[PDB]
């Protein structure tokens, strides 16, 4: 309807991810996870969520979310939410003001604390109305963040706020319960809305997921990291731009095929991308048209795991790779003659685009133009990756569509199979060995994945480099060196990572290795600890084992008993030094291994991430075993 | 075909004796041959020696540590213009070993039509028959069939014999073909071009382990450096093959391809383990044809990242003494020096124990490394251990470097003695 | 219209004119139904009395996602030229007392 430029499918430019309304909240949250300032963090959180006792920041958050997900709220609902905001604001102001008086009465502080916690618990369900959950899931996320913070301060400042030891233990129990209940409710709302939107179109589900990756899931990871003091809050989720027609995708089909095709080789850099382009202007009575028949991303050139998503065929002569040379383009030109000329072209070609000299694309300009003709939809495409014009439209000028995000870079380019059943090869599409491809006559869509800049070192050096200055390191499970067979990719966005590893191998063993390197100036005498995040639904009689392997100098770091638990659990090893592992500034084959024995039919266990933190900077503040 | 016949002869009259020579300096090891005999039925195809150990042998072996579970043929029959006699073509062979890996692919082609419809609608296309009728005033229906024949492994997991044969026919300096295929007791294909005499492919003391083909009419000089043991796709496109190759393995290897592990007994005094009978192998590994080792090959490690590792699964039978002392012998060829050396390790449910570390010096010949004595109680392995593993490992290499592993020897300390020193040259 | 039956450009060579082409397709789903594609030439000569007197030609329509499918029934005099493979189609007696079929 308009020929104006687009910005990530939107009519006006979008807000940078570091400039959103929830950014200072997340920044101080990470600062506090690093080092928690007792009996003082709740005031800062309250000043950042309700600045000057005003709900204006929450209205800004609501407006930004409404703009992103294309869902507005009725004025009555807005009035109800503001009423609840002011109700919380009154009690919060009372409690925050009473504490800053030097020499206050602790019993009155205890009363105010109880009133505030009760008021928050009471007004929480107002944001969980599913009819509007898609919009309120962000607003909900902040509220629990205001509450989970409070309780923690209450657990730390005990007799200072008039709490007895039984009060502290009851608060610890309440925290250990709420940190799981809030996550369960948040994930309930997320999965409901995501499945509902994907059943309509994949693009809308991807947009909702991109919104939750910024306003929701980092805070859930922060919740999961609040019981400690010293770990690093870091998000490695990717933003997915979808350009093309609408395709309905089931939720069983998302985490069974579509996400796997979107990720490809999860620990490899994109090196080549190939498109199957088709143009035809047969009978001039019908306008020109263009088709995208298939996308082929190539990461590791010597592995051959990823295959055609769509089809790479250009003709029916069964000649596409013989005579040594692969076919590239076929153009057929037809000439007619009427006594009372107009050559017709039919082109089927393979467009190739390699990775630039700096190994990564930063932006893109992909767009599609629709046309109606006797209740029939014709397409035209425009493709440009970085500075290389891959395809200009032969059907007329098409407005641009700048796909870019400040602080992100293009990591993957894939598509979605259109017009075929997406219910097959679920149990076959593993991480390795098996072929990652799906046949379909056309796709008519392109999906681009932007990864944050903090993951740019791994996809360039294939290893995790350690520095002396940093105090905490987070390693996602997908950034490995090699993984065993019968392993799957599980979408766990609540972990603030691009996924987790599901081991389900009934032979040999299940193992995952990670490459570690040391920078010049790294102290090898400093003591460190390892933290492993795993979910063990079925009992493992051999347990999980964390081992250090360095040029045959294998050393056992930890062995943990695996008991059945339908939730995430953290295992903490004993302290160690890098001189005990025999790793120096010249070690190039250092490896950390997480291993377990073979499983039984129907069993599997999940691995999310790893935390490496100095012994001095790590302390457990809230015990998890006291339920 | 003639090269394969010569190789089958040397596998019986030559190479076992060379292995015996290589094992004469000791006293206690086991002389055992695991070479396979290859029956080739079809037309003649010239193959270079660089192309044999670079593509053809790799396509003939397939998954070297997996049992054959399915075999699919692409059959074509046509009697177009009755002036020309009937003819039959073998357009492609597809062997399927591990159903959940997907490593092996079509050798030839699995296409049946040009409508690009072979896997849509949920169901894979199986057969296409076109029947043509004519009319002359002065009837004879013509058939054109393109189908996919499927044959799974029998109830006893292995075929013992076969009856594959081909019949040639000349017609105006043009060669027409007819085929007959039977695997075990299952008639896969009877010839529609007339009766063809049988051709009993069988060997007393051997069983069918692999069924493959050779690409005909295409250059065999590509994808040499890509066709590895794992990860990469093991396939080669060609319009026709017109040949079938069957590999018979000796009966002594029947336990491994059925139990996927090496079972140990108390009665035997020596055990030999070929390198190809592993549980898992690292990437960037290749198959090297070393028939002088009396095995179906050796492993070439050439990985410039992480590490090069090969693991073997070991199980113990009831009545095995765990207090008896044993030794390990590793046969390797190390052309380029390895500063980290080779390492033999024992991994049993996290009870990892280091068995040996050997300095790797450059040597263009085969060398044996002997570990110190050990007992199975030191490794923590019992009659119930199901995840016992022996690992041979080395660090990453440089560009152009590689090292070879042939076999392993497990013999009791009492029954092993070095009689002729190899270091005294 | 057109008398073509295939795209192999083979309709009158080898002395004999092509009459019928039937292609049968077989599929396989692990979780059979042969498909037929027939293109043929139906021939009907004039009867012994040189003229047809009546006929029974009819067509049946079917709707499927705003797409019209057809089925036909053809009978000239007493010779059944074509019975419908898409289901039974009611008759349509084309005849006039005092007239005879002259052109088709």
Numbering used by the authors:
A (entry chain A): 14 to 353, 357 to 643
B (entry chain A): 216 to 353, 357 to 643
C (entry chain A): 323 to 353, 357 to 429
Any passages from the paper?
We then focused on Cry11Aa E583, a residue sitting at the intramolecular interface between domain I and domain III. This β21 residue, condemned to be anionic at higher pH, takes part in the water-mediated hydrogen bond network that connects α6 and α7 from domain I with domain III. We asked whether or not suppression of the pH sensitivity of the network would stabilize the monomer at high pH, thereby increasing the tolerance of crystals to pH elevation. This was indeed the case, with an SP50 (pH at which 50% of crystals are dissolved) of 12.6 ± 1.0 for crystals of the E583Q mutant, compared to 11.2 ± 1.0 for WT Cry11Aa crystals. The dissolution profile was also altered, showing a reduced slope and no visible plateau up to pH 14. Thus, the alteration of the protonation state of residues and water molecules at the intramolecular interface between domain I and domain III may be involved in the early step of Cry11Aa crystal dissolution. To evaluate the significance of these changes, we characterized the distribution in size of crystals of Cry11Aa-WT, Y449F, F17Y and E583Q using AFM. All three mutants had a significantly reduced volume compared to WT Cry11Aa, due to a reduced thickness of the crystals. The structures of the other three mutants were determined, using the WT structure as a molecular replacement model for the phasing of diffraction data. We found that neither overall packing, tertiary structure nor interface formation is affected in the tested mutants at neutral pH.
